[model samples]
Target: STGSATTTPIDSLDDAYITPVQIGTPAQTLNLDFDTGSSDLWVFSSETTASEVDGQTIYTPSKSTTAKLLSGATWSISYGDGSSSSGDVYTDTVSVGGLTVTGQAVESAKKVSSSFTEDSTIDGLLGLAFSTLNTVSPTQQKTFFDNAKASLDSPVFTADLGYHAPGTYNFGFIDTTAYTGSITYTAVSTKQGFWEWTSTGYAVGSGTFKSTSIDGIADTGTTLLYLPATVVSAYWAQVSGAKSSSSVGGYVFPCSATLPSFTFGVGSARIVIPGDYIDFGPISTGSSSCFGGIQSSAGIGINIFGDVALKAAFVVFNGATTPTLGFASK
Candidate 1:
């Protein structure tokens, strides 16, 4: 079986992408953040306190006859920003696009952080990472993809993240017309419960490609592209008035400065991110200094190839016996 869903950016900065998902007996719909960086399919629910609930939709499992409580199962997960959520588990009928999973695990949130409550554009998160990353206690659960893969024509899912336009997420098969060139495949390490791979190297603008190994994860949940301080400094050095500031946090530069495009290799092929994409946006509402989309991963430990990089190409996450990743220019 094959299915497809449309995902749209929540705002101008593309803070996150939201996709509509159906759950339960009569199909209650909620706009959820399809996050490849996380592994728990969690959502706001009736169990949530009124004070913690904002304008987000709540999943009412009590109204769905197909919902069954997984007694004794509880889960909690924290984000890099310090926001977190925790609650009980329920197995319900979940569907994305037209594909359905009868016994998909759905984590119902009883508590949520202020950041999550304030974000009205998203109702919850649908994690696409490996099931091993799930935080359920007593009984581990499989991800939606893991449960649906058996019925899909192919055990793969592709992400087509548009720069400023809406994108599509396809399951089971690749849409050949969606990309411009042939895909270059690379092995992925799931040991860390992430879609981790090593890039051949990187280059700034029309400069020469450096033959260094840059290891990172293809995280759709994250908003920026984080790399080593050495590489980040090299790119910012090309622009005048660019500096790493503590006052504003991270790297910031004049909004009018001409930014250089960034290029990174995937196997033998390369994906080039436009200069305009690197100039994230103004640090504040009217500030002349703008925050960069690329930042250093020094303190974070692991480098992350987030939306800043993913938007430049079509990415495929293969979940076959031997997991692999495919990248193609779109």
Candidate 2:
């Protein structure tokens, strides 16, 4: 099992399912999504009509006396999921929970898709990831972490998925109580925004699957784990009489036995993902076989360890410190 607790669904606001962090002030409060895949903070403003803004959090400039709008700059962003939004830049006194920052730059999307515009509960996305992929450029673009770094006592930030537990997302510094022992840290690569790593090899239920090493990238924004075709087929072969089911996109299997443990070698460190985690939901058509960890992505690009893999570990993207990536017990 991963060091983190099993994810529990959050039902109450106090349980910390999601909290707002304001950028630039002592009065403004904007609800936002703490997305790790992209590093950008954006909100909707009153300047945009309800028809154009959709589900975006509307920041009323009149409500905050200190709010300022960017004269001529415009902002736009599109996600890998094919959703997009466009807006103008604005500065305001942003407040989240109780912490406040001054003079924060925010993008107010004028036109957003229904997926983003129809959500009444969702405000905006607060990107706590890396700055290299920021949509905002030279002058206007600033991440939530970039603005809050100076005000926070410790530059470090912690994300408590608590998705199953008291689900919450926190910033500033990590809560010391979250870990029991010394935290292990990894140096960040300068290649791109994603957390890229060199996988030494893979093991299933203590059995080796592939000898040829491959590189893996950890992306929280992605919901599924993508693996090479050869690696995926070799891994599924371990299951007794296990066969692929095309109904579930071919990543799923048909069997009754428990799946094997999956492990990945990162440098000298060995990270293990339990069998239960690999056992995706049961198949609908055939036998009671559950899905395996590795997925087939023959011609597709690099292998991605998505939310499923992240849920197993207490991941920390430490931008404030010299060494960026930190993984520890949740």
Candidate 3:
């Protein structure tokens, strides 16, 4: 078995990253948000609704004793910016970082929204995608890496996401000093349950690469980088006053513009993204206009690569038996 974790980032525009779970039976350490684009391991509990909790961190399954109560299970979810939540279901004994997953279904959040009750350092969501995108109901819950993927040890997992700093998520192996050079691998589909792949095109910094294939997803709970709108209007047409803003909904620029660095491809490996991570900051609160870590997946139909391109590389999801995706360089 294997496991390791540290996540972090919640500001400086790295939007959300959190991590530090371990619920029930005397553990109760919240912080969550490890989301690789939804699957449902939910939390923020004490059965939520206390006006949808404000300072977050709840999960009190009636003071655990290994929780239980999966009776007639229930759950609900919705996102892609429409935020939502719902819950009831328990099973317990979770844990992450040092692995351990005994019963592990743990949904709980009896209602939330208002952008997860105004964030308060997240306290919910661990979903690392694929358990057929679990949203539990009359029985449908298994994500905490699909019950820790049969004691991990090889059914991989890795995500290193950082940029404003602090990242890591190991599980089963492949840290080899976290990353650098050789890893490339691709070909994952999960039939839209995410971690999808296929990129092979793009380039805007040192220009001309665009071979074109695109498809996307790698979303660590999204926070920018959505492509196509002709590759986000060719990277804001190389920055200078940018635009595309329907009154600031996307694009935007001139907070001293300059930007650029984007690249992409994954088969013949490339990855790049820096230009100060596409400068996604200042669009208000002293705004001179900024917002843009790449955008326009044409109103979300697919293509995401979020966390601004997974904070520039080191991804791997690999749940083998035909599921694969690797990427590296870091």
Candidate 4:
């Protein structure tokens, strides 16, 4: 674990980037989404009814010699997008790329909502956020990254989430060749168990940057960019005929609307989110109206800079000491 290892992340339909992880005594391999907003390593498993888990690959702990069940300990979670899951806990060895951590808490899912059941490709979630967010009860659990950090030479990781293309996730060390220019870093506040940070300003549609402080988390599990309702409305206002629609799930406008780039400031660093990323296709299938990818994080409270915003830059999730993020032009 002293040296770093790189693993390729698969882009599944531009929705999420998943990476391969190994678990159990015999090394049961699984593809998991690396989520920074949560702190639990859960998987679709034998506990989940076969009929309910449509296309997911279930992990069978009973087949592993080293899987130890933590009786009376259970874990359950519900995400902002209404996805939910719950299961019993097990302590097993988990490995990602070349990093290995023994006695890791692995929640074997017994139940899942449509969100996990419907998406068949992803077998589980590997939370990279602070372990304080872990859902295991009776005793908290540590993330794979956290557990392996002490042994790592640098104790850092990089997220190179690409746009509709595959990218690489490097653990334990930084890969300078992956990005260009300098890596501008800003101190991050991990309150509430998220990579929460504040942006100094933002500009909509190539307009002058406005002094609007935006508070949000750099979430990899989320697919779209979520901003405040006012910020979302302001961006949509510039596009004629764009209006909010509950039935359509978000703001929609004529598909022909000329989308513009959005700029966000992060401590002297500017990130520009392309227009095509926001023009998230037709509001309804085959309809002339298009739904914007950027949405209002109204009920959620915190804005989410999901894949859309992250794809614009190369991100460094530095946790060696104080948690901070370094961003560079990709």
Candidate 5:
């Protein structure tokens, strides 16, 4: 089996892209963030406190004839960015694109952080990480991809993200039309629940390539690229009038300042992020100061190759065997 879904670029915030998903038997649709950084399909639903959920859609399982409650089961998760949620468990039919899976575990949120409650346009989060990272209690839960992989001709999904436009996430088969050039394959070590891999080194534009053994994750849900402080510092130095401001946060530079193209080594291939993409728009509206999309992953430890970098390439999340990632320029 094969399927595909269209992801639309939303308002620029911590979030930028979202895909639609259906839940329950008769089908209650919700816009969900397809996050590889996490592993639970949690949604705002009837179980959530009425006051805690606002300006978002809610899934009502009681209305679905096929919904089944998992007695005494629960789930909770805290994201690296401090957003969190917890809820009871239910099993239902979940569909994405043209693919549908029955008896899929769906977590209904009973509580959510202020950050999530204040956000608009999002109703749920669908995780694509390995099922081992699922947070269900009593018994672990399998992700939507994991449950349907066996029925698919091949267990693979391709993520093609575009800027302020629609991108497609195709599953079970590769769509040559979604990418260009040769796809550079790499070995992924998901031993820690995230899609982690080694980036041999990096360079600024056409300058000298330096070797810095860096292990990082490819997270589709995250909005910015995070690297080591030293690396971020060096990149900023290349931009005129660029510096980290105590009030503005991160490294901000004049809106018109020319940016240096950045690249990271993947095996023998180099994935490049253009100079224009690094400038993530003005940090504040009606202001000329702009913040860089690439920041320091100091306390975070893990470097996250977020949308800023992922949007620069076509990424394949291979799940048929020893999980691997294939990248190609669009």
Candidate 6:
């Protein structure tokens, strides 16, 4: 069974860019992103361009009496969505919740695309997925868990999402007070940084499609769930007289009726996706289509679980202890 750990308070919204945590001292704080998909710690600096730094928070090592930067290195990062950012390397005093780690290596983006430049709320993304994709060296790479693991009273660390808003991400020590059932853990394949899984089949309405098995991966960065054509068509067939709408590029049904429920079997775990996600509104094609949570991917064969699936369970990516993923009731 998976276990829960305690969390400490770092800082408040006023210091959205910084959170107070204890590293060597009690009052130190570090910049962090409460991300769900990847597990990585990175920060921005003074050397970055004004455009890249726009709409995002920048950390100054000079401001923090305890912060330091690693010199003579370069760092670049790219996402699955074809978005990319590049910057120089630095290290500083880092903290999360109540744990702090010193001399932590981070990247300061000097060049970022317009899409990222527009978002003023999200300065940078902190990866909480895995260490395999880490651009920083193993010895230098320090994540929230890496620094907090040693100080945690329990042997584990848990995250609670619900900060800011309903979908806004938040983390802390795992609180077991709300959970009353057994926690299920699935072994992770470490070939890459992303957690990959093999689907057993998909179920729509009263029928189960066994032939729809495929290889897929889980991601927290994405907003919607994607599926293959064969699987999607099979599931959409259950909808009553729904036609593919050109505006939405997929099948849409009238909002008057409730959409069908879809469930996916990932090994021993059966994940269910609600119908409200499929009830799409009228598109430019002048047809009411079923708004679909699952859509066609452009040759991206893997199915992404995204935040929709992750929110249903308490997900634990234990890279520090071992290469395994733990899941439990939220």
Per-prediction CA RMSD (Å): 0.9, 5.6, 14.7, 2.0, 1.5, 6.0
Model 3, 85-153: lDDT tens digits are 988888889888889888889888888889889888898888887888888888888887778886788
Name the candidate that leads on lDDT. 1
**Candidate 2 per-residue lDDT over residues 107-142, each given as its tens digit:** 776777766666565567766566777776445466
lDDT comparing candidate 6 with the true structure: 0.54
**Model 6: worst 10 consecutive residues (lDDT sum):** 9-18
Order candidates by TM-score, high to low: 1, 5, 4, 2, 6, 3
Q: What tens digits encode model 1's per-residue C-alpha lDDT throughout 78-153?
A: 9876789999999999998998999999999999999999998899999898999999999999999999999999
**Pairs in steric clash, model 4:** none
TM-score: model 4 vs. ground truth: 0.94
The RMSD (Cα, Å) of candidate 2 is 5.6
lDDT per prediction?
Answer: 0.92, 0.61, 0.86, 0.84, 0.87, 0.54
Model 5 quality (TM-score): 0.95
The positional error of residue 82 in candidate 6, measured at the CA in angstroms, is 1.8
In terms of TM-score, the best-performing candidate is 1
Error of 4 at 327 (Å): 1.5
TM-score of each candidate?
0.98, 0.74, 0.36, 0.94, 0.95, 0.73
**Candidates, ranked, lDDT:** 1, 5, 3, 4, 2, 6
Tens-digit lDDT track for model 5 on 1-330? 888999877775334688999898789999999988889999999989988998889999999998999899999999987889999999999999889999999999999998889976889899999888999998999999999899888899888888656788888988888777788888899889888887888998888888888889989988888999999998898998999887876889999898998998877777788887788778878778888988989869799989888888899989967998888878
lDDT of 4 by residue, 194-300 (tens): 88888777889878788878988888888888999988887888888999999878888889988888877788878888887787677657999987878899978
